[PDB]
């Protein structure tokens, strides 16, 4: 009925925080394991799936009071997360496997 | 699989990260310091607030009774004694250039050697771009110079910046923009059936404590 | 790390730009010179070497294997008598390795260093006699098996410049050679 | 308690416009000395909140103390000048205040706090006939001020001009349609204003307030008393009459349940026996 | 509880230790020139466990959500905290003559 | 590809031994040198000469003219600039809020 913007922006900020942190962690993990080529861009999708599962478990049942729809829990920050994932992937690879 | 010296990792890989991080923080703080200063006219803020009032009237007018909404819309859209009709008035490159300059300077000062290898393969056509400081035409395109590392960091730290950090118009033309949109609005009372909706269930007294 | 707060102490650096040059001279003298500065770290003398012999230096085992010492081989053939001799030594210190090389009873025509390694990580060396019988070094049971299973892939070629001949022999399973081309 | 809790308390008592001046100054006087070093740029908003509260508490021994430490850190600031004007007005010096506010309005003509303190004196001097006009002029200049739009409703209700107070409460309900209090106070204004032409709106709004906040009891009592008043009206038709006698019974079936849960909460006192004898009438 | 921060800290420490272990193994494999080039599953398990624990921890330390319905934040408000306007305050009431004249 | 020129000119700037001439040369030995850009060269004739040759100008080591002081000063010129601009922005925002 009446939606408070100060709450939807807080929820979007929490989602973006989760996304930016999981993307960096996944870049670091892919750089550590030495994954390369396609096995890094597949690990990124597996990590996004894990993050979406954790977000669904955090919202839990009666999530409709938190989000108007469950789409941001899946698509939220895919590209802005992929860029940071590539950066941290390159960093941890070129600092663990190279040198 | 080349073998690079740890001195490269300690003086070209990490310093580039530090540079591209702290210069971004500096750019943010400088954008804050030079935020804005615009001419504020009392008539401008008055007409802006009147436009916001008309917008919330044509948007949330379905909550007040019908008669008050008719009086307001009449006072606003009246050909005579109406505000919109009667009252007539008498009327980034700079953000992205420092990043390009720093990229050019980093290319100039850190040229002549391989910096790191991106774990995903790239096509050979980009060899003169990622390997500006190298004369080898046989080395793989995955091995990049320092400028490519700096640009990768510039594009990858934008989303990290959000973690460490917190993250009137032409009146003579504006009046018509609201007049033409308000002339087509009608009242749709939402309280015409609120009693029956409330009688459908009981009150949520649970949690009064 | 917390605690930190010559010929024996010589070790490999990072870039691997400093190596030990094992030089052989015609007077029968072997030297070990460090490549960084040029100081002779060890010397060795092979007595009864003639001025016009034919030398061949083969690195069998490197220093990458920590328990096993490095090992170099030198095949020196006397020009007049034809009798060739194998000298195995430690290219870092110069002491003759206690592994007795075989007594080559026949004049050696040529040699060949295979990438095949024994269980001791020693790249096998095959020497073809004048009677065209092949002698393997080290001739252990593992190398014998690895040659019995890899024989028809080994080919020797000898070039006689006085007659202008170029013969090529194939290694059989029992260390015998058959004329191929 | 720790200072990290006193700061949260002083922030909560500032987000909501509370006026518990005694409890505010009792915590502010400590934070001025006992924990001044634990918080940095948070001390200025605390100074402003404590000065205005000590003024209500009638203690100028702390008002000027918090005023000079704000005049020093912010020399010539317009907020501190407004604080000085409010202190003048609290010390019965209504003469220098108008001059100070006219001097403030000539430097920044967009200033509004001076415009509001210029009518605060009229409300304090009793010239409500002049205060309402000077506030209506300001509203005509600065529309959308949801504080002056409520002060105008208050002034009109005190002036018994219930007709024009509804025009302000409507401007307030259009901007905060999710606020049940603005619905309840509009229902009360419509109830006090007239008869069938206004009770028909008061009954709707006392129910809309309940729908927006099911824990509201003032809206419940208002709905009951507005349904009964339309049921007991001569110009009320039989349809409206029976619908109102249904609404009243439906509201009474919940008033007692609220009071029943209340009396159940207090094992000693029983409140259900108090309102039920009234609902049967 | 507020112990999620320590959880993500231990996870990040384990991840850094796994990175150092992978660096050591890569140095060893480039020293001996082996054709296997397979990371030890011992350090791979540690990397995966540390990543999972750290991600699950930062999912919790990110902060809780808030209801979208505005009618939920004003459910505890009262008219005693809405009538007061800090701009139109007047000081000629009885509190001045009663409390500390 | 350069057009065919039969004269393969000898330029003194190409001599890998400036004036350390090796009289009566008899052999040149080359070793891979561990890196990927340097070759260990040992020319043995009457005199023995040992050096390193970079056919591609040592593309995998840090420069010798590397200005350590320059970047070690720019790092501080950025850290302290951040540290003063943070407080400048905070004070400017405080002054703006309190007018």
From Swiss-Prot, chain B:
Gene from which the chain derives: EMC3
Assembly and oligomerization = Component of the ER membrane protein complex (EMC).
InterPro entries, per database record: EMC3, EMC3/TMCO1
How this chain sits in the membrane, per its record, is: Multi-pass membrane protein
Identify the species of origin: Homo sapiens (Human)
The domain of life for this entry's organism is Eukaryota
What ranges does the Cytoplasmic topological domain annotation cover?
Answer: 35-92
The record's keywords, sorted A to Z, are: Endoplasmic reticulum, Membrane, Transmembrane, Transmembrane helix
Effect ascribed to mutating residue 158 to K: No effect on EMC assembly and no effect on membrane insertion of hydrophobic transmembrane helices-containing proteins by the EMC
Instruction: Give the subcellular location.
Output: Endoplasmic reticulum membrane
Q: Give the Pfam families listed for this entry.
A: EMC3_TMCO1
Query: Which family is this protein grouped under?
Result: Belongs to the EMC3 family.
Q: What is this protein called?
A: ER membrane protein complex subunit 3
Membrane topology, Lumenal segments: 1-10, 109-146
The transmembrane segments are 11-34, 93-108, 147-165
* SMART domains the UniProt entry points to: DUF106
- What does this protein do, in the record's words? Part of the endoplasmic reticulum membrane protein complex (EMC) that enables the energy-independent insertion into endoplasmic reticulum membranes of newly synthesized membrane proteins. Preferentially accommodates proteins with transmembrane domains that are weakly hydrophobic or contain destabilizing features such as charged and aromatic residues. Involved in the cotranslational insertion of multi-pass membrane proteins in which stop-transfer membrane-anchor sequences become ER membrane spanning helices.
Q: Which GO terms describe its biological process?
A: protein insertion into ER membrane by stop-transfer membrane-anchor sequence; tail-anchored membrane protein insertion into ER membrane
Q: What's a single GO CC term here?
A: membrane
UniProtKB/Swiss-Prot annotation, chain D:
Recorded hits in Pfam families, A to Z, give: TPR_EMC2
N6-acetyllysine occurs at 246
Its predominant location is endoplasmic reticulum
The UniProt record lists the keyword Endoplasmic reticulum: yes
Q: What is the effect of changing residue 52 to K?
A: No effect on transmembrane domain binding of tail-anchored proteins
Which InterPro entries does the entry mention?
EMC2-like, TPR-like_helical_dom_sf, TPR_EMC2, TPR_rpt
Q: Where in the cell is it found?
A: Endoplasmic reticulum membrane
Please provide one cellular component term from the Gene Ontology annotations of this protein: cytoplasm
Q: State the Gene Ontology BP annotations.
A: protein insertion into ER membrane by stop-transfer membrane-anchor sequence; tail-anchored membrane protein insertion into ER membrane
Query: Does the keyword field hold Repeat?
Result: yes
Q: How is it modified after translation?
A: Ubiquitinated when soluble in the cytoplasm, leading to its degradation by the proteasome. Interaction with EMC2 prevents its ubiquitination and degradation.
What is the membrane topology noted in the UniProt record heading this document? Peripheral membrane protein
Q: Which domain of life is it from?
A: Eukaryota
> Could you tell me which residues the TPR repeats occupy?
78-111, 146-179, 183-216
Which keywords appear in this protein's UniProt record, sorted alphabetically?
Answer: Acetylation, Endoplasmic reticulum, Membrane, Repeat, TPR repeat, Ubl conjugation
Q: Assembly and interactions?
A: Component of the ER membrane protein complex (EMC). Interacts with WNK1 (via amphipathic alpha-helix region); promoting the ER membrane protein complex assembly by preventing EMC2 ubiquitination.
Protein family (similarity comment): Belongs to the EMC2 family.
Q: What is this protein called?
A: ER membrane protein complex subunit 2
Give the originating organism: Homo sapiens
Curated annotation (Swiss-Prot), chain E:
The record's principal subcellular location, in a coarse class, is: endoplasmic reticulum
**What biological-process terms (Gene Ontology) are attached?**
copper ion transport; magnesium ion transport; protein insertion into ER membrane by stop-transfer membrane-anchor sequence; tail-anchored membrane protein insertion into ER membrane
Could you tell me where this protein is found in the cell? Answer: Endoplasmic reticulum membrane; Golgi apparatus membrane; Early endosome membrane
Gene Ontology MF, one: ferrous iron transmembrane transporter activity
Keyword Signal assigned: no
Domain of life from the UniProt record: Eukaryota
- The membrane spanning regions, by residue number, are 2-20, 42-61
Topological domain spans for side Lumenal: 21-41
The entry's keywords: Endoplasmic reticulum, Endosome, Golgi apparatus, Magnesium, Membrane, Phosphoprotein, Transmembrane, Transmembrane helix, Transport
Q: What's one GO-annotated cellular component?
A: plasma membrane
**UniProt function note:** Part of the endoplasmic reticulum membrane protein complex (EMC) that enables the energy-independent insertion into endoplasmic reticulum membranes of newly synthesized membrane proteins. Preferentially accommodates proteins with transmembrane domains that are weakly hydrophobic or contain destabilizing features such as charged and aromatic residues. Involved in the cotranslational insertion of multi-pass membrane proteins in which stop-transfer membrane-anchor sequences become ER membrane spanning helices.
Subunit description: Component of the ER membrane protein complex (EMC).
Identify this protein by name: ER membrane protein complex subunit 5
* Source species: Homo sapiens
- The primary gene name is MMGT1
Q: Which residues of the full protein are shown?
A: 3 to 103 of 131
From Swiss-Prot, chain F:
The record describes the protein's role as: Part of the endoplasmic reticulum membrane protein complex (EMC) that enables the energy-independent insertion into endoplasmic reticulum membranes of newly synthesized membrane proteins. Preferentially accommodates proteins with transmembrane domains that are weakly hydrophobic or contain destabilizing features such as charged and aromatic residues. Involved in the cotranslational insertion of multi-pass membrane proteins in which stop-transfer membrane-anchor sequences become ER membrane spanning helices.
| TM region positions | 69-89
Subunit note? Component of the ER membrane protein complex (EMC).
**Full protein stretch here:** 895 to 993 of 993
Which disease is this protein implicated in? Answer: Cerebellar atrophy, visual impairment, and psychomotor retardation: An autosomal recessive, neurodegenerative disorder characterized by developmental delay, intellectual disability, hypotonia, scoliosis, cerebellar atrophy, and variable dysmorphic features.
What is the protein named? ER membrane protein complex subunit 1
Localization recorded for this chain is: Endoplasmic reticulum membrane
Question: Out of the domains of life, which is the source?
Answer: Eukaryota
**Stated family:** Belongs to the EMC1 family.
Could you tell me which residue ranges are on the Cytoplasmic side of the membrane?
90-99
Identify the glycosylated residues. 19
């Amino acid at each position: 009925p009446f939606i408070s913007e100060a709450a939807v922006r807080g929820n979007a900020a929490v989602l973006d925080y989760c996304r930016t942190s999981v993307s960096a962690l996944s870049g670091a993990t892919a750089g550590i394991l030495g994954l390369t080529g396609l096995y890094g861009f597949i690990f990124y999708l597996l990590a996004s799936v894990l993050l979406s599962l954790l977000l669904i478990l955090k919202a839990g049942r009666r999530w409709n009071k938190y989000f108007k729809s469950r789409r941001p829990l899946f698509t939220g920050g895919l590209i802005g997360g992929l860029f940071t994932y590539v950066l941290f992937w390159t960093f941890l690879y070129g600092m663990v496997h190279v040198y | 699989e080349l073998l690079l010296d740890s001195n490269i990792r300690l003086w070209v890989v990490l310093p580039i990260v530090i540079i591209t991080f702290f210069v971004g923080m500096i750019r943010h703080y400088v954008s804050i310091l030079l935020q804005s200063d615009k001419k504020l006219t009392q008539e401008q803020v008055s007409d802006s607030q009147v436009l916001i009032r008309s917008r919330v009237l044509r948007e949330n007018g379905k909550y007040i009774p019908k008669q008050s909404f008719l009086t307001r819309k009449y006072y606003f859209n009246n050909p005579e004694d109406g505000f919109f009709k009667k009252t007539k008035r008498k009327v980034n490159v700079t953000n992205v250039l420092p990043m390009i300059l720093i990229g050019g300077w980093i290319n100039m000062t850190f040229s002549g050697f391989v910096t790191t290898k991106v774990p995903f393969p790239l096509t050979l056509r980009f060899k003169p771009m990622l390997q500006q400081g190298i004369e080898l035409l046989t080395l793989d395109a995955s091995w990049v110079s320092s400028a490519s590392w700096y640009f990768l960091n510039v594009f990858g730290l934008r989303s990290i910046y959000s973690l460490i950090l917190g993250q009137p118009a032409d009146t003579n033309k504006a009046f018509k923009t609201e007049w033409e949109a308000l002339e087509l609005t009608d009242h749709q009372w939402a309280l015409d059936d609120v009693e029956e909706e409330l009688m459908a269930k009981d009150l949520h007294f649970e949690g009064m404590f | 790390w917390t605690s930190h707060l010559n010929i024996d102490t010589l070790a490999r650096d990072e870039f691997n730009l400093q190596k030990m040059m094992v030089m052989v001279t015609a007077s029968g003298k072997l030297f070990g010179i460090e490549s960084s500065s040029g100081t002779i770290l060890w010397k060795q003398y092979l007595p009864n070497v003639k001025p016009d012999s034919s030398f061949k230096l083969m690195v069998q085992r490197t220093t990458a294997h920590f328990p096993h010492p490095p090992q170099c081989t030198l095949l020196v053939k006397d020009k007049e008598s034809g009798m060739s001799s194998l000298y195995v030594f430690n290219p870092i210190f110069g002491k003759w390795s206690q592994v007795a090389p075989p007594v080559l009873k026949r004049p050696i025509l040529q040699s060949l260093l295979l990438p095949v390694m024994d269980q001791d990580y020693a790249k096998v060396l095959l020497l073809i006699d004048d009677e065209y019988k092949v002698t393997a070094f080290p001739a252990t049971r593992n190398v014998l098996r690895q040659l019995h299973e890899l024989a028809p892939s080994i080919f020797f070629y000898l070039v006689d410049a006085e007659q202008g001949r170029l013969c090529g022999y194939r290694l059989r399973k029992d260390l015998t050679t058959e004329l191929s081309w | 308690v720790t200072w990290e809790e006193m700061r949260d308390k002083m922030r909560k008592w500032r987000e909501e416009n509370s006026r518990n001046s005694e409890q505010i100054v009792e915590v502010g006087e400590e934070l001025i000395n006992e924990y001044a070093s634990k918080l940095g740029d948070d001390i200025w908003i605390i100074y402003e909140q404590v000065m205005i509260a000590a003024l209500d508490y009638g203690r100028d021994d702390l008002a000027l103390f918090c005023l000079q430490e704000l005049r020093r850190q912010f020399p010539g600031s317009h907020r501190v000048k407004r604080l000085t004007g409010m202190r003048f007005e609290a010390m019965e010096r209504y003469d220098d205040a108008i001059q100070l506010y006219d001097r403030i309005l000539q430097e920044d003509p967009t200033n509004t706090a001076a415009r509001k303190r210029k009518i605060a004196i009229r409300k304090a001097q009793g010239k409500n006939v002049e205060a309402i006009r000077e506030l209506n002029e300001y509203l005509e200049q600065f529309v959308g001020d949801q504080e002056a739009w409520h002060e105008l409703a208050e002034l009109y209700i005190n002036e018994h001009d219930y007709a024009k107070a509804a025009f302000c409460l409507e401007e307030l309900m259009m901007t905060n349609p999710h606020n049940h209090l603005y619905c309840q106070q509009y229902a009360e204004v419509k109830y006090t204003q007239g008869g069938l032409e206004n009770l028909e709106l008061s009954r709707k709004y006392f129910a809309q307030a309940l729908k927006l906040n099911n824990r509201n009891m003032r809206a419940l009592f208002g709905l009951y008393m507005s349904a009964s008043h339309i049921a007991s009206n001569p110009k009320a038709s039989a349809k409206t009459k029976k619908d109102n006698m249904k609404y009243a019974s439906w509201a009474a079936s919940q008033i007692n349940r609220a009071y029943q849960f209340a009396g159940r909460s207090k094992k000693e006192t029983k409140y259900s026996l108090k309102a039920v004898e009234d609902m049967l009438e | 509880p507020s112990l999620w921060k320590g959880l993500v800290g231990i996870g990040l420490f384990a991840l850094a230790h796994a990175a150092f272990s992978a660096a050591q193994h890569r140095s060893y494999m480039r020293l001996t020139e082996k054709e296997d080039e397979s990371l030890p599953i011992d350090i791979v398990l540690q990397t995966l466990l540390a990543f999972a624990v750290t991600c699950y921890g930062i999912v919790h330390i990110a902060g809780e959500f808030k209801d979208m319905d505005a009618t939920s934040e004003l459910k505890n408000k009262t008219f005693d905290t809405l009538r007061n306007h800090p701009s139109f305050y007047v000081f000629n009431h009885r509190g001045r003559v009663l409390f500390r004249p | 590809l350069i057009p065919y020129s039969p004269d393969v000119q000898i330029h003194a700037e190409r001599f890998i031994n400036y004036n350390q001439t090796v009289s009566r040369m008899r052999g040149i030995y080359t070793a891979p040198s561990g890196l990927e850009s340097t070759c260990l060269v040992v020319a043995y004739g009457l005199d023995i000469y040992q050096t390193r040759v970079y056919p591609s100008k040592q593309f995998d080591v840090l420069k010798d003219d590397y200005d350590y002081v320059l970047i070690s000063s720019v790092l501080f010129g950025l850290v302290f600039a951040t540290m003063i601009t943070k407080r400048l922005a905070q004070v400017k925002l405080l002054n703006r809020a309190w007018r």
